[PDB]
Write a protein that binds this ligand. Sequence first.
Ligand code: FE
Lengths: 688, 532
Amino acid sequence: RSVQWCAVSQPEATKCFQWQRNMRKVRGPPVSCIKRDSPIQCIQAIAENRADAVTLDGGFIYEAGLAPYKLRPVAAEVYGTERQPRTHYYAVAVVKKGGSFQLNELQGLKSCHTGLRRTAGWNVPIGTLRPFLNWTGPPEPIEAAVARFFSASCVPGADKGQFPNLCRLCAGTGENKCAFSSQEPYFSYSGAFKCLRDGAGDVAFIRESTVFEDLSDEAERDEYELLCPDNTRKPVDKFKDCHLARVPSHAVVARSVNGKEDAIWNLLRQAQEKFGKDKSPKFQLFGSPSGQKDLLFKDSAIGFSRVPPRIDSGLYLGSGYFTAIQNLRKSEEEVAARRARVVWCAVGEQELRKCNQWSGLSEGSVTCSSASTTEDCIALVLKGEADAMSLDGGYVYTAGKCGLVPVLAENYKSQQSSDPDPNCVDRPVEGYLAVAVVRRSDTSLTWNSVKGKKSCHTAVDRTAGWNIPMGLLFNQTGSCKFDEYFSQSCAPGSDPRSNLCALCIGDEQGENKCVPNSNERYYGYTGAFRCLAENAGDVAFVKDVTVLQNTDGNNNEAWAKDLKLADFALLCLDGKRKPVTEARSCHLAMAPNHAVVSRMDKVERLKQVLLHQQAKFGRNGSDCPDKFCLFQSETKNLLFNDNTECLARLHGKTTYEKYLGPQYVAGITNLKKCSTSPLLEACEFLRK
Amino acid sequence: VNRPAVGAAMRLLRRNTAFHREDGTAIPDSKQAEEKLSFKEGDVLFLYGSKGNKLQQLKSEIHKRDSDVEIRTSEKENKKYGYEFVDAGYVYTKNGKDEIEQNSGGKRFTHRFGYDGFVYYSGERPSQSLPSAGTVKYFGNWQYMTDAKRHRTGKAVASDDLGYITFYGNDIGATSYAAKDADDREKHPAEYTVDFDKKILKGELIKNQYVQKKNDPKKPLTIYNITADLNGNRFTGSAKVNTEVKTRHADKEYLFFHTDADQRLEGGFFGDNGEELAGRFISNDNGVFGVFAGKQKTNASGTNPAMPFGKHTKILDSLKISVDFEVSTMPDFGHPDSKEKTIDLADGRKMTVSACCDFLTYVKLGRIKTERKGRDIDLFLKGIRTAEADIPKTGTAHYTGTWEARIGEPIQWDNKADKAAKAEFDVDFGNKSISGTLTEQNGVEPAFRIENGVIEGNGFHATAADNLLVTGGFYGPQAAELGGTIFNKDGKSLGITEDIENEVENEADVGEQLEPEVKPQFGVVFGAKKDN
Ligand SMILES: [Fe+3]
């Protein structure tokens, strides 16, 4: 199909024509530019179905994302040598020869920014020096109403009319005195670097890849330096100790739906292999007709990695830089609240409403915001919208390998309970003991007798439901093909159309099949343990204590009344079948706990909320026969788990590789070598 | 609370579970604001129109609350009973954003969970009559909706144990469709034995118990017994639990269903054959609003006194001419009921009606009109059958009464068009020889001249340019009042199914129900009381 492109620099719209021209002389897709003056018109046009893609820096991606356009990147550009490629460019502050000024004293000095709301000219620098402008700004936006701080200042693209300072030093010579154009002699890193070479001002706010990209005379370096954050100023090329923001890189965008990661990634990979770094003289896609820099694309850059089908603007832009792009346009007595509200993330309605009751009693110190499945509750705890949740070990893996940490862990009551323990907070965790229970009515079945039968387990991707059993069955078989194992099976959270979600029933009307929330009757521990006892599959793989808490009508409902514990016995690895009461001897394996995952932001704070509105207000110790009941309660295994007889003291295992145990990480790395996951691969993109 | 109608619906009972005081602190001893809620009686949300329109009114109310949510309807069970006219179903939604109202100081004072919905029952064509001889057996289901207390035992045990999915029963109205212990395919059936010898109706109301492994036969526990007393179309009476509940299950079912409904069970047979059944009730502590509905066994053996129409003989009718001409039947309350009343009517705007002399209130007929497709002029015949106890077919009757003629769009005439609202009939009971005068211009001879309206068995053709036809019907005390319509208006006519050459019984948009005739252009509806 005809794939378009949205220029912004139409005088320099020649790295646009040359593209389709010396691609049509090869064969040519029907490309064209649809020019405008400012980029925002391009974001509009693409949202307005008028163009396909234009690359944006940080702040512009943010503005291009939120409603009502919802733009999504596809291809994150790569910066560095063809041997060692990365996509994390930096933003630094260049100065005069000696200068004698540090970044903390810029009162009246004559600055040179690079463009309104860009992450090396405006957002990062402002946020860096924001504790100095001191603007009570519900009225009086930042632009200059508080950028009186500097007396002289150049900031292209600024509204020339409103404020006097923001393009004085911008020598635009006419109505372009202030413009966001290609004809502003002080616009890009090169212009807002000549705004320091000309000595007209001192502090340039630009990338790290220019001091060597436009200073060919390699003796003129030792005077220009980089204004560091750490109260000092170090020589230029040591920038891994002097840079100011590990921002992400200009990332070609395209619409939310029909944005075509595929089409433009295809033509872009052809061009990446054909016209990339150090190649033919047929208009490489990285170069410049001398006089300008980064001409409506990027220059001095090798290529662009592909951004997975999971990443959308909030995820792409990081977490630090996203909190920073937001908490400047809201007042200091507002965005100091957000750093004290533990926005909790539930999964599915029922624990959302448990969470709302909590929010009510919380004293306004714990709000709530929910999601549908732990994949998406992660996709929230990432982009800032909810700073906590709790999940079963296999999910501590799938999450920690997305860049989070475990904070506390549901310290289950291990078999050696023997008492009510008051110091339940600081008794380090013990994992759980995952077993494979079966009904001794049928006596033929042995260990070798698992394949091809009817059997249902407790969860997908959790440790005791889909990865300790099927891991060992893979280690014996070798065919990591997961539906061929069993004839009919109820594993909650897989596809619903397979021969692997045929033995599930769902909800009341019978619609929510295998959905990983609490609406799939046979989901979760008691869920699989329903699927078995109702006699539709043979072997169940579940945590042990459930076969202990589903006799004597311990669920006093229909299905768990009338049942006896002398009616099921365990499996083993040999083939015997002993009595369940001592699963300490012939279980299926050990496994790690669940745990409360969160971010490195707000982790000294989730030791000030959860530590004393669970230890108190909290199921054994101050109230809740009546008010809170945040555990085994009126509700069962929602938002926690109903053996959660405390919350933990994780004791150092922040780096989950230090938490999950080096053996289970090995297991799940052996497993997820045949099975991908919607998240894991995108989030392994987000560590490149 | 027993003023019956076509369709009712109670709305779920969302309880105010917001701890902190309105403006203060946490209503002093640890409680919520509304720590109980029984029902009221400004809530039976009467409905009207087509079943789909009633359902859609409920739907639109929930929509008026919120517009993104999805409604979990009732259909996916009720097919199991193959209903045709009456339904006792449910609507609800659990996609709701709960109502929060906070205070300035951060505190909160109102919190209503999002679960929103109704239970409802809807009937069509109330049974103007009933099977008469022997007993009859209906099968069908019910639905209920309880109050919403906060501790139905005093231990706050999980609201999953006692029956229902979480948060139902303890913080909102415990309900039926959200009950999840039964023979999960069929939860709540019920059976109906009706005996007209004593004009009574007994019924058993059953909640299927639970089978561990989904193979066994059911364990039916009858939860509500029904003793109802007939009154034509409707029936009043009492819903009350059995005692097996109170004895065995004093912790699971004796804890919602625990007070009778004395004189507070209403219902109506629907289908003009009394072959389907609707009803409702509310337990006398206003704690269980429940609506039920059943249906014939489809093996309908006829009754010997053929009261219920629909493959038997009509007894009482409400006949209404449609919009501007044709005639139709409007479903029958079974109730008798207007000169220059300049007040509103249920049709939408200000009825300026003129219906004269009221020395006969049993049968009614004549003119209904209403001023602000359209509705211009209204002829009605609302006539109730005779009470078959007063005065038998031995005697003599002289009827005088009401009369009204219509022609269509051209200028029409009134009761005094005969120079007097006479509609005069002479008949002998012992011979059933209805005759008399229904004047067209003046007298008997300058009118339609057909007489000797004998009655054969139940059927009849009382009559009072050859080969004409006129029909009537009995009203008041036993054979004591008379009246009907001329069966000679146009190609079609007035009264019973239109004589329009008998091509298709309204199987299309043409209306070609019954037998042919010739085309004059004049119609009249008549009635009269006995004199002696
Ligand atoms: Fe940049």
